[PDB]
Design brief:
The protein is of the alpha+beta class and 23 residues long. 17% of the residues lie in helices and 26% in strands. A two-stranded antiparallel sheet has the order 1-2. The chain is globular. It starts with a helix and ends with a strand. 0% of the residues are buried. This is Peptide HSTX-I. Belongs to the annelide toxin family.
């Protein structure tokens, strides 16, 4: 995932640096 996992939170999908919730 993204480098800083905690930036996204708990399990997110990264799209160009943006951590979005995966469907």
């Amino acid at each position: 995932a993204c480098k800083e996992y905690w930036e996204c939170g708990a399990f997110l999908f990264c799209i160009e640096g943006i951590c979005v919730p995966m469907i």
